[model samples]
Target: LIDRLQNNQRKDRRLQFVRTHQEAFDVKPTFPLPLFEEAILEIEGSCSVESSCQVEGDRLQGGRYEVCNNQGTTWPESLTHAFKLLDKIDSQLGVRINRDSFDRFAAAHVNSRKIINNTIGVHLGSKLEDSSVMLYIHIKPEEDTEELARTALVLDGGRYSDELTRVLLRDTMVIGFELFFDGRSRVDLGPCAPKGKHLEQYTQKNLSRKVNSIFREGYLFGAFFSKTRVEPILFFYHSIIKDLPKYFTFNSLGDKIYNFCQSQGCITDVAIAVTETELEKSRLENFCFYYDQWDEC
Candidate 1:
């Protein structure tokens, strides 16, 4: 049979013998972490003009660990999903982060798969205020990467963040920026309400109105989440998501998302949630995040 295969060169039908017996390759198999969560860091600052993203955050540790926080198993579904998923990648990911470590929080490594050859950077800060527990996630990838892989990872991350936020403070809403860099116009930039399937969601009924106003008036967006039901709306900047299944794994999913977060300036993002329905609602407020930087078509 080996001699027969070697003789037949051009797309041989008989080669199907090898194809039939092949078993599915599991990326990795391991126990799942019951706590912890994941999300994309949308790394921008020093990385690329188009702002790359990667799957990074905690709930996955290097060695063994047990949850010290008294917070029970009642975590949101999304958070639980990420916490479970990270365990699969675990230490096999080309990076490591020490959750409780102060001086050396992030570390790098190599794997048999060479997972870092492509671009993907994972990053995070201590979410001490959000939960009693702490997390340290990690990954290692090249400096430059693609958008498609990052987007999928990012969407998963967003869901994780949204649900975690909701669980932490049940009266929270999903608010995200469109983040586009269309170089055709004059320094055209500013976040708008999300479009596409986001609008299709039943929850989007009053969402765009609230989101648009939040963008325009610079009002605290979380206040609106209170009056609305808990549904997540995301803006992933989808131009490729339209045509279904034409391009399978656009390129190098094996070469795709290793782990990346722009890992920007100190306190790259912030949010607010209301504990009391009425301060009679007190007032509050990443504005001015710009430069003369231009883009391309």
Candidate 2:
């Protein structure tokens, strides 16, 4: 070598790279928000009683059929009366009553499909602090809606209050009512439970005692005396995937999630982990790709 060429600071730097993926998953059963029931109640309230449910007591005089909230007109009977009443109204209206009209009316008014299509359990409410009275509304899908509504309406102290009317007929369907310990409290009318403690705003002095009490003095006792009809339901599992990676294209991610679900033999709903604004930006800017693949990168 003619000359000593020394590269003093030519040090080898090992190129290092790292990748991180965070996955969080959970599976829980979900119930369809009881909106159909709310819808029917809303429709019934909005519709003219004379048109929807009025029946003649005598030849010349007609009377409105009592809704499920009135006494001597129990929930089941109310629903039964509702059908008959509607039939009478249609006949009087001179509207050609066909199977279609009856079918639609029955489906909406007292259809078991309307109320109990995607739900379970009797809607119940209770009070604590001394003697407690538990109230319940039972809907039987196989049975007639008129009879069901009428009979359910016949419970003690059952009256359709304007307040209840408001809650049950809100613009949006999920009606939230309070768990009552205060007389002023509007009762939570859904997702029934046997043990009071199982419900929100309820506490148990002792679990065993409370269970025994529930059996002795609450729903069990009520059920026995009322001979309430029950519906048997079979429940299935569903997968809900949330907080998914936004780096992947929406279609690709959806396909992957769908494939995974197919392999698992269950249904799945994929929720991307991005805000609406960010999602719009990502979509418009085409930011849903690896940084390494980006032209600027």
lDDT (CA) per prediction:
0.21, 0.23
Which residues of candidate 2, in runs, are more than 4 Å off?
A: 1-80, 85-137, 140-191, 195-197, 200-297
RMSD of 1: 21.2
| Colliding residue pairs in candidate 1 | 43-262, 120-259, 120-260, 121-259, 121-260, 121-261, 122-259, 122-260
lDDT of 1 at 73: 19
**RMSD in Å for all candidates:** 21.2, 27.9
Q: Which candidate leads in lDDT?
A: 2
The alpha-carbon deviation from the true structure for residue 70 of candidate 1, after best TM-score superposition, in angstroms, is 45
lDDT of 2 by residue, 1-297 (tens): 312111111110000000001010111111111221222242211111100111111111111111122112243333443344334323432222223322332344453342421111111111122111112233332333343233223321234445332222221111111112222222222212221223212213212232232232222111111112121110111123222232223444334333443343111222122222333332322111110100011
Q: Point to the candidate with the largest TM-score.
A: 1
Tens digit per residue, CA lDDT, model 1, 75-183: 2222332333334334433323222121111122112121111112121212211111222121112212222223223332333344333232222122111111111
Consecutive 10-residue window with the lowest summed lDDT within model 2: 13-22
